[PDB]
Each structure stands twice: as structure tokens, then as C-alpha cells.
Design a protein around this nucleic acid. Structure first.
Ligand SMILES: Cn1cnc2c(O)nc(N)nc21
Ligand SMILES: [Ca+2]
Length: 581
DNA sequence: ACTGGATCCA
DNA sequence: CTGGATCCA
């Protein structure tokens, strides 16, 4: 179509080093760790400039400019640029605006993943989607210099022009401090985390993988004996044919293409045939083997024996982070065979230890705070076992009349309450009927009328405003809250109930990370953040710092915000992640 | 099936 | 160009 004017520079000049600029330090590899910087673009009051990285990054004044906190840069996905630079021994500072995080706050549902998607939100279309320039995947190539250079300049141009309107809307939404004081500082901390990585004991993992391949070989053969034939145990067609046609097992549930084989269903079928328990066992081992063992071993960098996740800070609808390549927010814990995987996550230096602090029932505590339910707030003020308390109220029994099955039902009710309670959902979860679920629910609201009030109020608020909000003013638009379709409307209503809870808990732990990173430097500790797992933080530190951390970390996490109820943090440390329990 | 995720599989 | 199964908070 048209061409944007810019200087294709081949040396750094002084006018490129103004104290405010849009900056693009482009990394095209999806995974940016130790990845190439393919080009650089600067747009400031003086003009528009493209620089080849091998020039710019070898230039002393440019590098000094990058690291000077007083020279302000506007960017998109500054964490990607900061991390690729960290791997090159270069420090990036003074990022005062990140367009990706600004777009995220304004509307998490837009799924902005390039400068073009963010630009579209304010009707600016003078820039191409990255996919148009680079291609899909495995055809994805860096193009030739004139194509590349104009593209980076156009993105930088967009960033320069869109700061004002993004900030104005953030300000109108009261989300400007959310971006400036929370999401942007947190982005620097995440960059440090990702870069630091987590040391992995690959021999431990290789040996677990060996035992797994052993057991898996045994179970697989047994399965073939019992089926009287070989088949692909991971094929849905083939396993369905064996269970339900050759062995004539009852069909308790269908998927929309065939028979359900979820573990749920399989447990009911166990009484009928010895094959079932074995398939369950195979699925358990096979998940461990192919996802955790083989998966982790594939992404460990052999140069450092570390894994360097990426924490996606602009993806979830609620404001949580997610983690990819590897996902280190889903390492097994609940069953012991899987938990053993955590034995392979080790401190990065000798005589250091892993330290883990987790919030105790933050969501339920946030809910008490938001709903101001007198009885919920008393329960946490009396630091009660919340599930046992809910069993007492719903079943009207005394503490020592609470049976294990009673506590289990009340636990499930507590989960449903935070998720957005559903008589069907609870009934499915508990394997009971909707009418019996409805009465648990009804008993819950009699015991906790402030919470019922909150669930009613928040749905009406979502309806009238068009969105819900968290404690630190994160927003989520719920246009389906008025659908005439029952399923669709009900789902929005759950999102209305859950999002201030889940999202406020995200707000809190994010603030806690920022506060903690400041306190650790103030305290001159060598301890640092490795991971966040929604309501927990994992650090590593010299053994000599364990005692100060036992007091410091819970204190900081507990005081991140002050609610109508206290927050409670437990901590553990040990020589592996497995032992910090 | 009552929230939010990621990855392996076919 | 996915949707089922299963691991996490
Ligand atoms: C075998 N195989 C590879 N990719 C696939 C996909 O997307 N769907 C299905 N059904 N099979 C696939
Ligand atoms: Ca497909």
C-alpha cells in the first residue's frame, strides 16, 4: 500500500538517545530465551530510526542508553525484549509504558498478541499483524531488511502514538496505577525469574523415567493379556472398541464423538473387568512419563541444567499468570508417585535451599472480605478449618460429629461457592443429584447470608455496568450476562461471581511479589524468586538465610493488603522442591 | 460440569 | 482451523 519514512541508520547517533522514545527490540522466535534480536527501532521527537542489532548492541552509548532508568521507553512486551537482552549481558531500564500490559488491563478478552492487535483497539491500522510479515509457523521466517525495517518502525510509530489514548482510558477506568505500580514493576520481576531459571537434577529424572518405562511395560502387557489382543491404549476409537464392544462394558456416558473414557467413568466400571484398573494405572504412569519426565527433559538447557519457563502476564481472563515451556504451575503434588517429580527441582548453588510460602484459603478469605459475611469473617478470625466449619453449619452438627464424608461434601461446596455455585456442577462433582445439591447450596446461604447477598449483588452489578472489577481495579467485561440462552447466561453469572475473587487473589499475590522483591534487596539477602503458583511463591536462598526468610516472606505476603480478615501464610523449605513441604 | 490455566494424543 | 483426558491453583 504505502511506505513510512525512517532513517535506515548504520551507526548510532546522539539524536537516537533522547530521553523519551518508543523502542522495539525485536525477537521473532516464540520462545525468547537466548534468542536472536533481529532488529531495533527507535521513534522519538527527532525521527524514526532502524538499527541492526550487531551495530546497536556493540555501541557503548546505545547500551548505556538502554540501561539508563532516566531515559524513558515505551514498548510492547518489554519482558520479551528484557529477557533476550539479559541473555546477552545487557540491562534494559526505564520502561515507563508497556502497550501489551495496557491493552490487557483495558480488555483481557481482546487477546492482543502483537502491536497490530493492540493498535486496532483505538482504530489505528497503519501497522501489519506480525503473522502477515513473518508467516504462520515452520514457514515463519525473518524477511529481508527493507521489509523487516519498515515493519519494526511502523510498530514503534504505533507504540509512540498510542500511549496517550491507552493511558487516558486506563485513567478513566482508574487502572493507571494498576499498570504503572503493579503490572509494569511485576514484569521486571518476572523477567528476572525467567532468566534465573530453576535447576533440575536430570539424573534423578532420567532414573524416574527408567522406573516408569519399566512399570509401563508391565501394565501395557497385562492390558493386552486382558483384552486378549494388542491395541493402541491411547486411541479413543480403539480403547472404546475394546471396553464397550469387545468386553461389553456398560456405556455410562458419551462424549459428542464416542464413548467417555474419563477416569471418572472408568472407576465405576472397575467392578466389571480387571482391565479397567490397569488402564487407570497406565494413564497415571503415562501422564508422568510423557508429560513430566520426557517433557521436562526436553526443555532443560543442557548448558546450565536449568529450565526457563515463560510466565505469560497478558493471557488469563482473571489476571492470573500462566506458565509455559515448561508449565511449572502444574507439577504433580496430590498423589505421591507424581509428587516425586518435585525431587528433581533443586537449588541452583551448593548449600542453597528451596523455600515455599503459600497462602491459606486466600480466595475464601477474599470472599469474606468482599461480601462482608459476618459468619464467614468470624470463621477466618477464629482461624477455623473452613471445610469442617461449613460441614457443621450445613449439616447442623457439632465439630466432633463431623464425619470424613461430611467434610468432603462441604469442601466441594466451598469450591463451588468460589467458582460460581451450580446445583448441576456440584451434583456432578459430588456424584449426587441436583435436588440434593440444591439443598446443600440452600443450607450454605442460610449459614452465610452475606455471601448469598454478594452473589446476587455482583450479578446485578455486572449486568448494569457491563463488567466486574477486582480489589485493585482489574476489569472483565461480561456481555453474555444478558443472553437469553440459559447456558450462556449462567456461565457469565459464574464468571461474575468468581472473577472478583480469583482476580483479587491475583492482585494480592502480585503486590506481594513486588513488595517481596523490594524487601529482599533492602535486607541485602541473596534469596530470589523462582516461581509463582497462583497463591504460592517459591524461592531459593543460602541455607544461612532460611531463618530470616521464615519470618520475612510470610510477613510481606500477609501484609501486601489489609482486608476485613487476616491473611495467613505457611512456609516450608528443604533441599529440593519435594522437601519444601 | 460449579473458576482459571497447559500439554500430550490421535 | 480440535477436543478428550489429566495435571495444577
Ligand atoms: C493424528 N493427528 C495429528 N493431528 C491431529 C489432529 O489435529 N486431529 C486428529 N483427530 N488426529 C490428529
Ligand atoms: Ca486437528
Amino acid at each position: 500500500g504505502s511506505k513510512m519514512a525512517f532513517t535506515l541508520a548504520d551507526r548510532v547517533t546522539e539524536e537516537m538517545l533522547a530521553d523519551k522514545a518508543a523502542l522495539v527490540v525485536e525477537v521473532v522466535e516464540e520462545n525468547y530465551h537466548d534468542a536472536p534480536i533481529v532488529g531495533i527501532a527507535v521513534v522519538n521527537e527527532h525521527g524514526r530510526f532502524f538499527l541492526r542489532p550487531e551495530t546497536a548492541l556493540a555501541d557503548p552509548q546505545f547500551v548505556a542508553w538502554l540501561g539508563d532508568e532516566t531515559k524513558k521507553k515505551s514498548m510492547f512486551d518489554s519482558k520479551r525484549a528484557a529477557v533476550a537482552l539479559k541473555w546477552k549481558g545487557i540491562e534494559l531500564c526505564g520502561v515507563s509504558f508497556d502497550l501489551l500490559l495496557a491493552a490487557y488491563l483495558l480488555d483481557p478478552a481482546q487477546g492482543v498478541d502483537d502491536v497490530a492487535a493492540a493498535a486496532k483497539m483505538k482504530q489505528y491500522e497503519a501497522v501489519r499483524p506480525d503473522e502477515a510479515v513473518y508467516g504462520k509457523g515452520a514457514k515463519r521466517a525473518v524477511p529481508d531488511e527493507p521489509v523487516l525495517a519498515e515493519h519494526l518502525v511502523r510498530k514503534a510509530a504505533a507504540i509512540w502514538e498510542l500511549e496517550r489514548p491507552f493511558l487516558d482510558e486506563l485513567r478513566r477506568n482508574e487502572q493507571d496505577r494498576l499498570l504503572v505500580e503493579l503490572e509494569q514493576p511485576l514484569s521486571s520481576i518476572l523477567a528476572e525469574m525467567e532468566f534465573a531459571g530453576v535447576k533440575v537434577d536430570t539424573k534423578r529424572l532420567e532414573q524416574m523415567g527408567k522406573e516408569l518405562a519399566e512399570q509401563l511395560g508391565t501394565v501395557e502387557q497385562r492390558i493386552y493379556e486382558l483384552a486378549g489382543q494388542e491395541f493402541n491404549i491411547n486411541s479413543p476409537k480403539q480403547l472404546g472398541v475394546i471396553l464397550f464392544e469387545k468386553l461389553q462394558l456398560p456405556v455410562l456416558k458419551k462424549t459428542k464423538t464416542g464413548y467417555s473414557t474419563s477416569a471418572d467413568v472408568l472407576e465405576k466400571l472397575a467392578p466389571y473387568h480387571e482391565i479397567v484398573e490397569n488402564i487407570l494405572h497406565y494413564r497415571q504412569l503415562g501422564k508422568l512419563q510423557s508429560t513430566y519426565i520426557e517433557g521436562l527433559l526436553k526443555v532443560v538447557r543442557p548448558d546450565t541444567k536449568k529450565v526457563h519457563t515463560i510466565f505469560n502476564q497478558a493471557l488469563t481472563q482473571t489476571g492470573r499468570l500462566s506458565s509455559t515451556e515448561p508449565n511449572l504451575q502444574n507439577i504433580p503434588i496430590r498423589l505421591e508417585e507424581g509428587r516425586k517429580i518435585r525431587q528433581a527441582f533443586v537449588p541452583s548453588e551448593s548449600d542453597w535451599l528451596i523455600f515455599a510460602a503459600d497462602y491459606s484459603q486466600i480466595e475464601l478469605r477474599v470472599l469474606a472480605h468482599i461480601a462482608e459475611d459476618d459468619n464467614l469473617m468470624e470463621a477466618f478470625r477464629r482461624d477455623l478449618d473452613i471445610h469442617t466449619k461449613t460441614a457443621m453449619d450445613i449439616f447442623q452438627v457439632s465439630e466432633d460429629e463431623v464425619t470424613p464424608n461430611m467434610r468432603r461434601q462441604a469442601k466441594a461446596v466451598n469450591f463451588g461457592i468460589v467458582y460460581g455455585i451450580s446445583d448441576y456442577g456440584l451434583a456432578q462433582n459430588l456424584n449426587i443429584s441436583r435436588k440434593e445439591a440444591a439443598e446443600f447450596i440452600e443450607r450454605y446461604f442460610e449459614s452465610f447470608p452475606g455471601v448469598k447477598r454478594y452473589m446476587e449483588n455482583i450479578v446485578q452489578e455486572a449486568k448494569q455496568k457491563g463488567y466486574v472489577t477486582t480489589l485493585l481495579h482489574r476489569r472483565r467485561y461480561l456481555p453474555d450476562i444478558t443472553s437469553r440462552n440459559f447456558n450462556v447466561r449462567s456461565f457469565a453469572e459464574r464468571m461474575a461471581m468468581n472473577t472478583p475473587i480469583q482476580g483479587s487473589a491475583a492482585d494480592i499475590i502480585k503486590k506481594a511479589m513486588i513488595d517481596l522483591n523490594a524487601r529482599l534487596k533492602e535486607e541485602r539477602l541473596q534469596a530470589h524468586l523462582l516461581l509463582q503458583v497462583h497463591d504460592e511463591l517459591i524461592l531459593e536462598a543460602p541455607k544461612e538465610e532460611m531463618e530470616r526468610l521464615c519470618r520475612l516472606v510470610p510477613e510481606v505476603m500477609e501484609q501486601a493488603v489489609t482486608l476485613r480478615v487476616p491473611l495467613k501464610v505457611d512456609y516450608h523449605y528443604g533441599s529440593t522442591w519435594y522437601d519444601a513441604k
